[PDB]
UniProtKB/Swiss-Prot annotation, chain A:
Keywords: Acetylation, Cytoplasm, Endoplasmic reticulum, Isopeptide bond, Ribonucleoprotein, Ribosomal protein, Ubl conjugation. Coiled coil: none annotated. It comes from Oryctolagus cuniculus (Rabbit). Its main location: cytoplasm. GO terms for molecular function: structural constituent of ribosome. The gene is RPS21. This is Small ribosomal subunit protein eS21. Component of the 40S small ribosomal subunit. GO terms for biological process: translation. GO terms for cellular component: cytosolic ribosome; ribonucleoprotein complex; rough endoplasmic reticulum.
UniProtKB/Swiss-Prot annotation, chain C:
There is a cross-link at residue 26 (Glycyl lysine isopeptide (Lys-Gly) (interchain with G-Cter in ubiquitin)). Keywords: Acetylation, Cytoplasm, Isopeptide bond, Nucleus, Phosphoprotein, Ribonucleoprotein, Ribosomal protein, Ubl conjugation. It comes from Oryctolagus cuniculus (Rabbit). The gene is RPS13. There is a cross-link at residue 42 (Glycyl lysine isopeptide (Lys-Gly) (interchain with G-Cter in SUMO2)). This is Small ribosomal subunit protein uS15.
Curated annotation (Swiss-Prot), chain D:
The keyword Iron-sulfur does not apply. The gene is RPS15A. Belongs to the universal ribosomal protein uS8 family. This is Small ribosomal subunit protein uS8. Component of the small ribosomal subunit. Part of the small subunit (SSU) processome, first precursor of the small eukaryotic ribosomal subunit. During the assembly of the SSU processome in the nucleolus, many ribosome biogenesis factors, an RNA chaperone and ribosomal proteins associate with the nascent pre-rRNA and work in concert to generate RNA folding, modifications, rearrangements and cleavage as well as targeted degradation of pre-ribosomal RNA by the RNA exosome. Required for proper erythropoiesis.
Swiss-Prot record, chain E:
Its main location: cytoplasm. This is Small ribosomal subunit protein eS27. Component of the small ribosomal subunit. The ribosome is a large ribonucleoprotein complex responsible for the synthesis of proteins in the cell. Required for proper rRNA processing and maturation of 18S rRNAs. Part of the small subunit (SSU) processome, first precursor of the small eukaryotic ribosomal subunit. It comes from Oryctolagus cuniculus. SUPFAM superfamilies: Zn-binding ribosomal proteins. Binds 1 zinc ion per subunit. Residues 1-23 are annotated as: Disordered. The modification Phosphoserine is found at residue 11. Residues 1-16 have a biased composition (Basic and acidic residues). The keyword Transmembrane helix does not apply.
Length: 82, 208, 150, 129, 84
RNA sequence: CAGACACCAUGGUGCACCUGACUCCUGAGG
RNA sequence: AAGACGGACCAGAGCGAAAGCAUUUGCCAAGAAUGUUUUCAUUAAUCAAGAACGAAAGUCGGAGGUUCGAAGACGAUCAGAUACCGUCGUAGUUCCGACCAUAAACGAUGCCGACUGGCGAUGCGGCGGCGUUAUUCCCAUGACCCGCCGGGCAGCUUCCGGGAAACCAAAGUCUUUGGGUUCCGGGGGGAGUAUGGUUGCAAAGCUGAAACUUAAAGGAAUUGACGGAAGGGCACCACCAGG
RNA sequence: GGGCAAGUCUGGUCGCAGCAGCCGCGGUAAUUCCAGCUCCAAUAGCGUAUAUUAAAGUUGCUGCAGUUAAAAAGCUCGUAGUUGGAUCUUGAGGGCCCGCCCCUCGGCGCCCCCUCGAUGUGUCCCGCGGGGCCCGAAGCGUUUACUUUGAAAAAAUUAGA
């Protein structure tokens, strides 16, 4: 949370989400991301360089999360048989 | 993705699926599993879409990969049919194994007679592994799980459509998972399938 | 919301977006105007004319052929019923209930029902009076209700 | 039936947003609803909307975002002569550093910062932040 | 719903199963049809939910029978809306 | 389930109680 | 013969504004739901006054009193019974025209609209199937099965959201406080009493005070103790069989 | 003693005298009394009674509660009263801003008069000054509430230079 032209107030900058556009606050439970490994393709065999999605308390308790992850993953690629 | 032709499935898988009785589902209507469904069999029963089962299995597998220690993924089954299944998975992939009773508190309890440190849980039915599923969301752990059309979807991140109760259905999915993770990172390598048969998994199958 | 009936449901059709229906044979102005004039001669209400035109002829409403509706045609011609069709049919029910009430003086239901129908007539009539479709010097009465329906 | 149309729309969005749902069907659809949505949209509080046209009265599908915290309605409307605006702003907004009070002025439906510059008051519709 | 969907062009089987005024674009699905039927020697236009019978000169009586829903028809018939 | 099933009223009192700092201090040597 | 009453079938099922409403059949008008490119073209939402209906008892005049039965009188049981319990039996139950206007008239939850969640039934209407059965030559019928859609009484399971909790998809969208409108409450007692008015033939109904009294009246959950409340056990300080 | 800041006081009393808004003390080892001592708070002031205000969202416009705690009329119709669906048009200059679109004046113009340049009771550039008529403009078309700018708007008070 900035003050003025871009002075830093603040204790830290929290994680956000894009499955419901709501911040992960402050020490909350059921808040974790999900590193899917990339594969380099064509020759196979995992190469880095994680794709990370941020999952909040809210989505998980409302049993959304399964579908959400696929929408997020597909939209930016890449998984075989899409 | 990976090398790519056999990751768009192949006949070999489609034969194994049909044999293991994966394809049939429940008769309860859906609102979170509904997308996955291929078509509905006459007078109830849903035919799951093998294409969807594939992609989810691969995304799951990929998440276990990019950890350089395979021990901190806990494979969990309390189902009888999947006790042998997870035991073989743990030999192969190098998972830390939980067959039979979970015994409440191993991701919780500072004072306990056992403690396990995972980073990702893989569950065979979260209405039988309900204790891990609840316990995991008290201590900030993501959980993949094998879900049918009447399993809870709350606190499950990535679901894999499948019957996943009884028979060879639980076995086969553990076999295919192990095969997949070994492809990306293992010693099957190069994104080609295992030389081990699914029959090493499955259930004990009463011995004559 | 309904304070004129104890219902909860619906009682109107859905209507289409378009100003042309059905667009494969909408006939001509001529045909349906003749038909309207002849039907209105017999003393038939706009409701009845609309029903028979819809189903038998390839018109649906006559609002989609020309901008006029059956009432508008009637009104401009000067050959029209002398009160709105709805108001007529309301008055007619209150007559019918009144006749039933004359027959039976123990029918408590009929007394309750009559009141409701009569109130409904008055609110509709008030609306017509304000907008000069009824004269304000006429008013609903037992007496005159009989005379209209006859 | 509906004696305000703003109040229904605002609630509808908020209740969607709570779920994580990214669609609503608001209706009856009016000129003021369009105008309120555009000002809201511009500041980034909601996403883009699409007006579907019917001969009933219209229906709008709003694709919303969770950049909003609350859009309240001031029903019944009150007069604001630019010296009750200050009173409202301290009362009903969490800071003076952000959030807009949205009014209807004779110089157009506008946010209260623009109102202050014009010095044209009017009737208060609602607010958001 | 899985509670995050947004549909801007909805499929015509989940919009065509619903009630007539509950549709997401509201026009009813009712139509006109031509009825040939053999004891009538003219092509009578009929309304799908006719209510009161359609009859014609060419038939004795055989054209429609009343039903509260879709009007009953007898022997050979056709339908084309056409264009609602 | 699918054997038997009755009168019976009355009666009083107090104190339950609230803060943290490990030595037997070893005591020939120390 | 008289008078009364319509079991089992009968259900978290239907209808009716509510009170209420189960023998058969016919007649009379009425209401909802549904289907509906029909009609009108804003006619609407909700409410002082005003008005319709209103179980039971009671009261006016008859019919009628089978059955049962407020009162009374009897037999028991009890320390006390005038009660419960047995018997005799009155008004009354039933029926008609008048009064009366209240009920825990209980879902203790104003009315109208919008929005926010899963699953399966069932009364009813409509629609759909290379579904079953059934009838006429097969049908169109109809009952059934599956799917779909409306409007009913409800249920189930849920960090959907609320609440003090019990509960509650509304008692949700309330400090991030504001859709419309109406009604009632402001600690507990005095008291629906006093007093004046009003309605009623009467019985009664409506409006409705104060002095004074007093720091608790109350709600909910929790934990104990206790029950001539329900399932249990264990012991010759209990019983049994007996000394 | 608690609320309440400052006595696990010393003597005396012992449910007595008193204390005590309220909660409660005192019935013999009274940190509440009655004195003494010490300490606290405010300090030329402080205590007390009482009206009113604040706290009090315990009158709730902003901003109340009504399943069970105090509280939805037996139910419906319904007039006043309150409230009410959708729907009509206004390119350049400079790096937004300005006028516009689907006759009493000013004045594009037309006609008049002293006439202004062809002219010096008077034209043919024009209504420029007075006119009439009549366009961009504008009463325009039918009203407003609202909001906006002005005036009219005691001094003291009050904010405040």
């Amino acid at each position: 949370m900035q003050s003025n032209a871009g002075e830093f107030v603040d204790l830290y900058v929290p994680r956000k989400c894009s499955a419901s556009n709501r911040i992960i606050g402050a020490k909350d439970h059921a808040s974790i991301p999900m590193n899917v490994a990339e594969v380099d393709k064509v020759t196979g065999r995992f190469n880095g360089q994680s794709k990370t999605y941020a999952i909040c308390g809210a989505i998980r308790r409302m049993g959304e999360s399964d579908d959400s992850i696929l929408r997020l993953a597909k939209s930016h690629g890449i998984v075989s048989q899409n | 993705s990976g090398a790519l032709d056999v990751l768009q499935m192949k006949e070999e898988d489609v034969l194994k699926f049909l044999a293991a009785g994966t394809h049939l589902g429940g008769t309860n209507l859906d609102f979170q599993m509904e997308q996955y469904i291929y078509k509905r069999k006459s007078d109830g029963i849903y035919i799951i879409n093998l294409k969807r089962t594939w992609e989810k299995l691969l995304l799951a597998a990929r998440a276990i990969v990019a950890i350089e220690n395979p021990a901190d993924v806990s494979v969990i089954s309390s189902r009888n049919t999947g006790q042998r299944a997870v035991l073989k998975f743990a030999a192969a992939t190098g998972a830390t194994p939980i067959a039979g009773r979970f015994t409440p508190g191993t991701f919780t309890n500072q004072i306990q007679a056992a403690f396990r440190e995972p980073r990702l849980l893989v569950v065979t039915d979260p209405r039988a592994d309900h204790q891990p599923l609840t316990e995991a969301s008290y201590v900030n752990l993501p959980t993949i799980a094998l879900c049918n059309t009447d399993s809870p979807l709350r606190y499950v991140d990535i679901a894999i459509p499948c019957n996943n109760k009884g028979a060879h259905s639980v076995g086969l999915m553990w076999w295919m998972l192990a095969r997949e993770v070994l492809r990306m990172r293992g010693t099957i390598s190069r994104e080609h399938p295992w030389e081990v048969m699914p029959d090493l998994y499955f259930y004990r199958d009463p011995e004559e | 919301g309904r304070m004129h009936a104890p219902g909860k449901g619906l009682s109107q059709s859905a209507l289409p977006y378009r100003r042309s229906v059905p667009t494969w044979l909408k006939l001509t102005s001529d045909d349906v105007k003749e038909q309207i004039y002849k039907l209105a001669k017999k003393g038939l209400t706009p409701s009845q004319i609309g029903v028979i035109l819809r189903d038998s002829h390839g018109v649906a409403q006559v609002r989609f052929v020309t901008g006029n509706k059956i009432l508008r045609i009637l009104k401009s011609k000067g050959l029209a019923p002398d009160l709105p069709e709805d108001l007529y049919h309301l008055i007619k029910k209150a007559v019918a209930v009144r006749k039933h009430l004359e027959r039976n003086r123990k029918d408590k239901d009929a007394k309750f029902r009559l009141i409701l129908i009569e109130s409904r007539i008055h609110r509709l009539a008030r609306y017509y009076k304000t907008k000069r479709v009824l004269p304000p010097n006429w008013k609903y009465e037992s007496s005159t209700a009989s005379a209209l329906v006859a | 039936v509906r004696m305000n149309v703003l109040a229904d729309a605002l609630k509808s969005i908020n209740n969607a947003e709570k779920r994580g749902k990214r669609q609503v069907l608001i209706r009856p659809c009016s000129k003021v609803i369009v105008r309120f949505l555009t000002v809201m949209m511009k500041h980034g509080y909601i996403g883009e909307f699409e007006i579907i046209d019917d001969h009933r009265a219209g229906k709008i599908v709003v694709n919303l975002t969770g950049r909003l915290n609350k859009c309240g309605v001031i029903s019944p409307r009150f007069d604001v002569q630019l010296k009750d605006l200050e009173k409202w702003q301290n009362n009903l907004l969490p800071s003076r550093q952000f959030g807009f009070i949205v009014l209807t002025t004779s110089a157009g439906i506008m946010d209260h910062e623009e109102a202050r510059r014009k010095h044209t008051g009017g009737k208060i519709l609602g607010f958001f932040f | 719903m899985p509670l995050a969907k947004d549909l801007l062009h909805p499929s015509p089987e989940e919009e065509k199963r619903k009630h007539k005024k509950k549709r997401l674009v509201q026009s009813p699905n009712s139509y006109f049809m031509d009825v040939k039927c053999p004891g009538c020697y003219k092509i009578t236009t009929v309304f799908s939910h006719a209510q009161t019978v359609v009859l014609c000169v060419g038939c004795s009586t055989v054209l429609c029978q009343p039903t509260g829903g879709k009007a009953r028809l007898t022997e050979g018939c056709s339908f084309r809306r056409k264009q609602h």
